[PDB]
Amino acid sequence: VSPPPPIADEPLTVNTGIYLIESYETFKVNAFLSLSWKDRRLAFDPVRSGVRVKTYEPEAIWIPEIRFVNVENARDADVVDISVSPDGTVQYLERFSARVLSPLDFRRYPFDSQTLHIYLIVRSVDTRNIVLAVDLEKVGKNDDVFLTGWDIESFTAVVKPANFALEDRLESKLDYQLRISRQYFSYIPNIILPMLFILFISWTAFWSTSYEANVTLVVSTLIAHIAFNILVECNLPKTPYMTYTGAIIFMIYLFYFVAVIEVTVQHYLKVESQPARAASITRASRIAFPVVFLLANIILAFLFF
Amino acid sequence: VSPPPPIADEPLTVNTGIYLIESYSETFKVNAFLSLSWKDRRLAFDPVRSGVRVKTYEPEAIWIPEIRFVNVENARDADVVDISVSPDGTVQYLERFSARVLSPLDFRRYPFDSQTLHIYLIVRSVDTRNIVLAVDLEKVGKNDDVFLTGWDIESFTAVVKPANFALEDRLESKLDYQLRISRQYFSYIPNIILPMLFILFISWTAFWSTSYEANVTLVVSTLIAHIAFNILVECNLPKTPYMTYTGAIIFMIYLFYFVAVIEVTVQHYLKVESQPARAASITRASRIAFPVVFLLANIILAFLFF
Amino acid sequence: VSPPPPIADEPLTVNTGIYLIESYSETFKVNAFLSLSWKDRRLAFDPVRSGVRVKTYEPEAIWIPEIRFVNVENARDADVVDISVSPDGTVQYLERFSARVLSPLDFRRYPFDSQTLHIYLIVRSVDTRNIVLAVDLEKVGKNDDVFLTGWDIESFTAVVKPANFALEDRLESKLDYQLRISRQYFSYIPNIILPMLFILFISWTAFWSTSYEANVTLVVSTLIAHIAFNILVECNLPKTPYMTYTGAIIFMIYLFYFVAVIEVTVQHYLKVESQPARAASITRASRIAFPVVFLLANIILAFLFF
Amino acid sequence: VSPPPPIADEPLTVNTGIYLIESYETFKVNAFLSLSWKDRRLAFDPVRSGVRVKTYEPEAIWIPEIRFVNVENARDADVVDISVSPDGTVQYLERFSARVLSPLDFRRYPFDSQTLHIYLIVRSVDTRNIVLAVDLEKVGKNDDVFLTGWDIESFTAVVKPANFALEDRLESKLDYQLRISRQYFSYIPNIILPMLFILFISWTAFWSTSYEANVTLVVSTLIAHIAFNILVECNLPKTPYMTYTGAIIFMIYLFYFVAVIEVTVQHYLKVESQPARAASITRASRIAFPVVFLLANIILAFLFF
Amino acid sequence: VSPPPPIADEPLTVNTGIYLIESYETFKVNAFLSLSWKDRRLAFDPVRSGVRVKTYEPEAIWIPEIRFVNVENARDADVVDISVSPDGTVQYLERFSARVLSPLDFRRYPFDSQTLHIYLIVRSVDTRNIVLAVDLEKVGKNDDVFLTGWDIESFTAVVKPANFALEDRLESKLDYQLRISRQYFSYIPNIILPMLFILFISWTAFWSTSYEANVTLVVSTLIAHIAFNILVECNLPKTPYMTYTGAIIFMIYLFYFVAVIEVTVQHYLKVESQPARAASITRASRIAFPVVFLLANIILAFLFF
Secondary structure, eight states: OOOOOOSSSOOEEEEEEEEEEEEOOOEEEEEEEEEEEEOGGGOOOHHHHTOSSEEOOTTTSOOOOEEESSBSSSOBOOEEEEEEOTTOEEEEEEEEEEEEOOOOOGGGTTSOEEEEEEEEEEEOOSSOOEEEEEOGGGOEEOSSOOOTTEEEEEEEEEEEEEEEEETTEEEEEEEEEEEEEEOGGGHIIIIIHHHHHHHHHHGGGGSOOOHHHHHHHHHHHHHHHHHHHHHTSTTSOOOSSOOHHHHHHHHHHHHHHHHHHHHHHHHHHHHTTOHHHHHHHHHHHHHHHHHHHHHHHHHHHHHHO | OOOOOOSSSOOEEEEEEEEEEEEEOOOEEEEEEEEEEEEOGGGOOOHHHHOSSOEEOOTTTSOOOOEEESSBSSSOOOOEEEEEEOTTSEEEEEEEEEEEEOOOOOGGGTTSOEEEEEEEEEEEOOSSOOEEEEEOGGGOEEOSSOOOTTEEEEEEEEEEEEEEEEETTEEEEEEEEEEEEEEOGGGHIIIIIHHHHHHHHHHGGGGSOOOHHHHHHHHHHHHHHHHHHHHHTSTTSOOOSSOOHHHHHHHHHHHHHHHHHHHHHHHHHHHHTTOHHHHHHHHHHHHHHHHHHHHHHHHHHHHHHO | OOOOOOSSSOOEEEEEEEEEEEEEOOOEEEEEEEEEEEEOGGGOOOHHHHOSSOEEOOTTTSOOOOEEESSBSSSOBOOEEEEEEOTTOEEEEEEEEEEEEOOOOOGGGTTSOEEEEEEEEEEEOOSSOOEEEEEOGGGOEEOSSOOOTTEEEEEEEEEEEEEEEEETTEEEEEEEEEEEEEEOGGGHIIIIIHHHHHHHHHHGGGGSOOOHHHHHHHHHHHHHHHHHHHHHTTTTSOOOSSOOHHHHHHHHHHHHHHHHHHHHHHHHHHHHHTOHHHHHHHHHHHHHHHHHHHHHHHHHHHHHHO | OOOOOOSSSOOEEEEEEEEEEEEOOOEEEEEEEEEEEEOTTSOOOHHHHOOSOEEOOTTTSOOOOEEESSBSSSOEEEEEEEEEOTTOEEEEEEEEEEEEOOOOOGGGTTSOEEEEEEEEEEEOOSSOOEEEEEOGGGOEEOSSOOOTTEEEEEEEEEEEEEEEEETTEEEEEEEEEEEEEEOGGGHIIIIIHHHHHHHHHHGGGGSOOOHHHHHHHHHHHHHHHHHHHHHTSTTSOOOSSOOHHHHHHHHHHHHHHHHHHHHHHHHHHHHTTOHHHHHHHHHHHHHHHHHHHHHHHHHHHHHHO | OOOOOOSSSOOEEEEEEEEEEEEOOOEEEEEEEEEEEEOGGGOOOHHHHOSSOEEOOTTTSOOOOEEESSBSSSOBOOEEEEEEOTTSEEEEEEEEEEEEOOOOOOTTTTSOEEEEEEEEEEEOOSSOOEEEEEOGGGOEEOSSOOOTTEEEEEEEEEEEEEEEEETTEEEEEEEEEEEEEEOOTTHIIIIIHHHHHHHHHHGGGGSOOOHHHHHHHHHHHHHHHHHHHHHTSTTSOOOSSOOHHHHHHHHHHHHHHHHHHHHHHHHHHHHTTOHHHHHHHHHHHHHHHHHHHHHHHHHHHHHHO
C-alpha cells in the first residue's frame, strides 16, 4: 500500500502521543503509542456500511513507519486498536515496552534531577512529506508509575518537531521528556555518615603520641575506608566526568595522606628532641583537620551547586 | 471479526481466572493458566440439531477479547490450550503464560516481612461496546508444588471488584491478582545477625584493657572485620533508598564503633594526663553503658518498625 | 483438526519418552528428544495399495496431542524431527527440545549431596475424549557424552504410573522424569575446608602466648582472614535460607573466634589482676579444650546431618 | 528471483553507505544501511508510467544478500524504503541495530585511541559477480552520537573494497571505521592518585627505626594497595598481553617488596649492632625509592608512548 | 518432499564443511555450513536448459535435516545459496552464529591447550539411510580469526563419521575440532609474581625475634594473599577437579601455616629460656622454607606436566 495523496501540496500530519503505563542505574518504560492521520482512500458512508467506525488490521491499511530513536532494539510492538472515522481519520493505538537509552548526569549525584528522553521519528516518502504532531490529550502517565529512589516529576513533549534533511529526504523528530529527581535521604546514614566516622576515627591520632598506635590508627582506617568504598561500590558512579562525590572521595584519600605526614613528622620531631614544636603541630591538627575539611566541603558544594 | 452485539445497552463481562502452575527466580517469575469466558450469541447453536455438546475453535476463527497484563516485563509468551463454545454462545478460553512480576518489594521490615505480589489484568473497551472484567473464583488458584524458596506462599486471591476508569477518552477495566508471601527468617540469625554481633562484642573487650596499642587494634581491627562481613553478606542486605529496620541496625553499629573509639581515645588521654581515677571510672561505666544502650536502642527500633 | 474418536469409551494413551543428548550451565539446562506415540485410525492405510511401509506428515497436517512441560524456565525451543504413521494408524512423533531444569537443590548436605532433578510432562484432556500419558521404556534414556561437571550422572528414569487429577473442571495426566546426579566432593577439602581450618588453627596459637598485643593481633587478625576467605569461596558457600551442614560449620567457627577472644581477654585480665597461676591454668586448658570441643561438635553435626 | 543480467561481462556494483543514529568496555551501534544498484528488468519510461519512482517490497524484487562480518548474530533488520528510479536504480534503505565485535588495544589505556571496525560483505553468484562501492554522501553520523568517556573523532569508509576468493566464489568486503579516543582526565584523581598516596604512605618507614611501626607501615599498605586494586577492578584491564598500566601495577608490587627488604635489613643491622650502616641505607632509601620510581615511570612512558 | 531414492541399497552421503568467519572463559563462533548431496529428481540436460546451474529456495527442494549437537539453542540459520549442478548435486550454503558447548580442562591452567568441539548430526529416515562426509576444500577458517589470550592452532574435522543406532533408527555424527593453546606470559607479572612476593615478605620473619612483628608479619601477609586471590578471582579456576594452579595455591596456604608454627614455637622456646635452639631452627627456616618450596614446586610441575 502507498501513502494517502495530498488534497494540494500539504504534508501528512501524524498526531502522536505517549502515555506511560509502567515505568521501571538504567531505565525501561512500558506505554501506549497513539497515532492519528487522515487517509481519505478509507472514507465510508456509515449508512451503506451499518457501522459508526470500521476496525482494520495493520496489514490491511497504510500505517506510517514510526520509529523510535534512542532505544535498545526493534520495539516489542503490540497493536491494540485501529479505527477509521467516516472521513478516513485513522486512530491507531499500540502498546510498547522500551528501554530508555539516555546517559545520566552524575555530576550532582545523589542530589540530582534527570531528564529521560524518548525520540519519535518518521522519514518522509517520495509520494509525500510526513510531519509529526502532538495530541496533548494523548500524552501522559498512569499513577502506578513508580521509579524506586526517584520522584517522577513530569512526562511532557516538545510540541514543535525537529524537521531536518537526512540522506536527501526529510525527517520529523519528536521529544518526549520523563523528568525525574532523586530520593537522597538514605544516602546520609548509608554512604556519607560511616565514611565520615572512619575518617574521624583516624583523627584521634591527634590526641596520641604512640607512633605504633598512630601508624595503626591512620593506616588501619585507610584499609577501612577502601573496604567501605567497595561496600558501597554500587551507590558510587562509574563516571569518567568530574563528580561531586568523586572529588569528596578524592579529598578523603588526600586527608588520609596529610594525616600520615603529620603523624610521621610528629614522630620524627620527637625522636629529634624538638617535642615543644611537635606537640604544637599535633595541637594545631586537632583544629586544622576538621576546619580545612568543613571549608573544602563548602568550597565543593558551591563548586557543584 | 467485530465484538458480539448487546441484547440491550449492557457491557461485555469477561470472566477471568489465573491459576499458578509454577513460581521461580530477589525477583519473581510466574508460569500459569489464564482462563477467559464471555457470551457470543453469534456463536450460539441449538444443541439438538448440532448433535455435539460443544465445538472447538481456533483463535483466528472467532472474536477473542484483547486481554493484556499490566505489571509484567514484555509481551507474554502466549500459548492457547483450548477454545470451547457452549450451546448458548458462552466461550471458554484457556492459555498458558509464563510472566515476570514487575512489583517492587517493601524492604522496610526485612527480614521479618510479608510481601503482596501484584498481577494486573486489563481490557480496553471498543467503539462497538464496553468491556468489563469479572472473576471466576473456581478458576483462581495455585498448584501445591508452588514453592518460593525462603518464602511462605500464604494466598493467591483476586480483588473481585474491578477498577473501571477512562483513559484517553475510552473506558478500561483493571483486575488485581495478589500473591501474598511472607519470608522464612530463621536462618538470618546464625548467618547475618549473630556473627555481626560477635564482631561488635569482640570490640567491647577493650573495656577490660588499658593498653592503647591493644585497644586501637581492638576497636579499629574489628571495624574492618564488620565492613568485610557486611561485604560477605552483601546479597542478603537490601539496596533500599529508604530507611529500614535492618538498615538502621547496621548504621547504629557503625555509630557504636565510633563511640567505642572515642571512649578508648578518652581513656588513654586521661591516662597520659594522669587522672586514672576518672579514666578507670569511664572504662568501668562503658562495660555496662555499651551493652545497655545497644539493647535499649534495638528495642526502641523494633518498636519503631513493628 | 479434532482428536481421534474412541472405539468405545476408552481414553487416548500417549506413549512418551525423553532421551538426553546434553546437560549443562548451581542451576541446570537440558537438551533432549521428546518421543510421542498414539493411535489415530483416521490416518491408517493399507500398505499394498499405498506401496510404502510408512508415510510422513507435517505437524500442521495432523492432530498432535498438546503435550506441555511443567517445570521449565521458558516456553520450550521446539523442533520437529520426524512424524511417522504405521499401517494401523500409530503415529510416531519426535522432537528435539532444549530446556532449563527448574528444580531446587537440597543443600542440607552440600558438598556431600545427591540431587534428584525433575522433568514433568503434562496433557490436558479435551471435550471430545480423555487423554492419558504412558512411558515407552525403550525411548527413555541418555547418551554417554552426558556430562555435568562436578557431578556424577547416576540415572535417568521415569515414574511409569502417571498422576491423573482434575483441574479447572477438566482432567489432567502428569509424568515424572528423574535425573539423579550426585556430587564430586574431593576438591572441597584442599580448597574450602583445609585453609578455613588452617586460619582457625593459626588463631589457636594464642594459647602458647602471654602477649596481649600478639594475642589480640592473633585472634582478631585471623577473624578478618576467615571473613576474606569466606568471600574468596563465596560461590562454593551456599545462598540457602535453610539449616545446612556447611552453614553450621561456618557458624560454629564464627563462635570459636568469639570464645577464643573471651579466653584471650580473660587471660590478660587475670594477668593484670595478678592471679597468673589461674590464668596460665585456663590458657593451659584451652590448648586441649578448643581442639577437643571442635572435633566433638563436628562429629555431633556430621551425625546431625548424615 | 534471479540477479539482473549484465549488459556485457561487467559485475554488479552495489553502492553502500552507513550513517550512525546511535552508539552505546563493549560497543553497540544503531544506523542506516543504504544500498543502490541498477536492475533494468525494473526500469521504465517515466512519461508513459506517470509516476517518478515506484516503491517495492523486499519480497517483490531481487535485493543483494549483504551481510556484516564482525557482529554478534543475524542483524536487527528493518526495511525503511525501496525506490526504483526510471533507469532501474534500486535505492534501498534499512535501519539496523548491531553489536560491534572488535577487540580493543589496551596497551596504552587510559591514553588510547581506538578504531572500531564494521565489515560489509557480499558473495558473488553463479549468474553474475557482485562488487561493493561507497556513496560518500550516504556515509556519516548524527551529532547526538555519544560514547560516554570517549571522543568520537570520525566515521569513514575505506573506499577500495577487498576482493578475494572463498570456497571457489568471489567475495567483496568493505571497511567502515569508527575512530574514537578516550576521556582520560578523571583517571588521575580516581586511579593513579590514591594508588600513589598508598605507596607514599609506605615510604614514611624511611624516617622510622621502629620495626613494629615499619612492618605495620609496609605490610599494612600492601593490603591497602590490593584492596584499592579491587576497588578499581572495573577500570583495570583484563589483557593477556602486556600494558602500560599493567606494568606500573607490577612495578608497584615490586616496590612494596624492595621496601620490605630495606625495612628487614635496617632492623637486622640494628640487632647485629651496625647502626652506622643501617642508618646509611634508610638515609639513601629516602632519595633512592622516589628517584628510581620517577625514572622507571619515565622509562615505561617512553617504552609505551 | 521425500528424500531422493537409492540407485541400489546405498545410503545418502552428505558432504559437510564448516569455515569459521569470526570467533569470540566461554566461546562463540560465526561460520559457513556447506552441505552437498545428489538428488537425481533435480537433474537436467545442460545443453537444452542453456544455463550451467539453477538456483532453488529451501522450501522448493528436499534438504537434509542437519542439526548441531553441542551448541546452546537452535542455530541462527541464514541460507546464502542453493545450487543444482546438471547431475542433481546440491550445493547448499548457510551462515550460522553458534555458542561452543564444550567444557575446558583446567588441569594445566595457564599452560593449557584446549580442543573446542562442534558436532554435526543427521538422523536417517524410513525411506533411506543418511551418512555424513567431509569436503576438505570446504573446511577452514578465515585469518582475522582471533581469540584473545589464545593461539588458534587448527580447525580440522575427524573425516570418519561416528555411525550408531538411536531409538531404533541410525544416526551419523561428525567431529569439528578448534584446537587452541593459551597466551600465558602475562600470568607471571600478574598472578604468580605478586603472590610469590607476598609469601616472600612473610619469610622475613626468619631474620626477626620480635613475636609482635612476627605475628604481624605472618598473619598480615595471610590477609594480603587471600585479598590478592580475590583480586585475581577471574583468572583462576572454579574447578571441582585437581589443578596444577589449585595445588600451588593450597601449598601456599599450608606454607603460611608452617610459618606460623615455626614462629610460634620459636617465641615459645625464647620465653622458656632456650634461646640456643630457637635461634638454631629459625636459622634453618631461612633455608628450609625456600628449599622445600622450590622442591615441592618441581615435584608438582612434574606431577602435572
